[PDB]
């Protein structure tokens, strides 16, 4: 039995859980209408969480509302924060969010999300407020993809594709179950390291000794060069390319790499970053890296990228 073990690694918010969900959609018939119903509350919760996160950031970043009236909605939001913990988003709550998301001050703060920590499901949910606020609303599969869930252990998914048995593990941030956790690192066919390209312009936070991209690099450096992984494919998912492309128009890559003398085209930057990662591989004669530029929330893109990742696996054990 040729059985394939895949381990997802990468900093938090790099798209790991999304890739997992994406395998369920692409290779395991997705989510049934029942399951979609179960994420109703999650969608509502994340929406509430997302708008709160911006509101709270306004206080810290010292940004006034566009219209002074919104102060009431801010106060109203915290009162109503729990309203959706079952089913409906009351009409009253939807208007609060609608009016806040509209406001010029809130927006200025949303533009400045590099200056704090705003999740990338935020605008997806908020721009579709009108749609999700209907009482009859059933989450679409794209809505489920965009859900942000706390996990407290190892996430696993399994499927059969091209006559091969795939087991994929997103080992969490919790070693609160070692051994099973350590095992996820054992007998791996391919490691898939995710990088949020769009982190390149994030401000150096007060709890960091280097920016997020270099943290991702340091991490990749150690995975890539670990003697345990000599016989394991290293696959690099430079992810969030959609966001990266928009950002790079405005924020120079020199923000992330001061020494960078290239240009702020999507093409030239993405290539520079790839090089920064791939140069970390210190065994180039005995190992090569498989870089892919992905948008993990885009089912069609992932299908294609994963299809290609599989083709290499097939062509691999036909040699070895």
């Amino acid at each position: 039995a040729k059985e394939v073990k895949l381990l997802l690694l990468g900093a938090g918010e790099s798209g790991k859980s999304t890739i997992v969900k994406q395998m369920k959609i692409i290779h395991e018939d997705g989510y049934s209408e029942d399951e979609c119903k179960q994420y109703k509350v999650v969608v509502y919760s994340n929406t509430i969480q997302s708008i709160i996160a911006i509101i709270r950031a306004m206080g810290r970043l010292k940004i006034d509302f566009g219209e002074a009236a919104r102060a009431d909605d801010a106060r109203q939001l915290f009162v109503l924060a729990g309203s959706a913990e079952e089913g409906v988003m009351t009409p009253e709550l939807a208007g609060v969010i609608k009016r806040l998301w509209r406001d010029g001050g809130v927006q200025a703060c949303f533009s400045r999300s590099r200056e704090y920590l705003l999740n990338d499901s935020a605008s997806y949910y908020l721009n579709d407020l009108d749609r999700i606020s209907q009482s009859n609303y059933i989450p679409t599969q794209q809505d489920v993809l965009r859900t942000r869930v706390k996990t407290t252990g190892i996430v696993e998914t399994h499927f059969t594709f091209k006559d091969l048995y795939f087991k994929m593990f997103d080992v969490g941030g919790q070693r609160s179950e070692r051994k099973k956790w350590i095992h996820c690192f054992e007998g791996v066919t391919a490691i898939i390291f995710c990088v949020a390209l769009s982190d390149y312009d994030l401000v150096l936070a007060e709890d960091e000794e280097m920016n997020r991209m270099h943290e991702s690099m340091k991490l990749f450096d150690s995975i890539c060069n670990n003697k345990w992984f000599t016989e394991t494919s290293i696959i690099l998912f430079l992810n969030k390319k959609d966001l990266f492309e928009e950002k790079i128009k405005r924020s120079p890559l020199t923000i992330c790499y001061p020494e960078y003398t290239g240009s702020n085209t999507y093409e030239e930057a993405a290539a520079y970053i790839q090089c920064q990662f791939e140069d970390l591989n210190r065994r180039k004669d005995t190992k090569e890296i498989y870089t892919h530029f992905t948008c993990a929330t885009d089912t069609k893109n992932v299908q294609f990228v994963f299809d290609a990742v599989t083709d290499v696996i097939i062509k691999n054990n036909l040699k070895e």
């Binding site: 938090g12 918010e13 969480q49 999740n119 942000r148 869930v149 706390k150 070693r175």
Partner: peptide, 22 residues
């Protein structure tokens, strides 16, 4: 190597006030 630690620390930093339990 402190290799397992480094990973543990990295992947845990994922905006928990903006995620929800299931």
């Amino acid at each position: 190597e402190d290799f397992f630690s480094l990973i543990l620390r990295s992947q845990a930093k994922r905006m928990d006030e903006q995620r929800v339990l299931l």
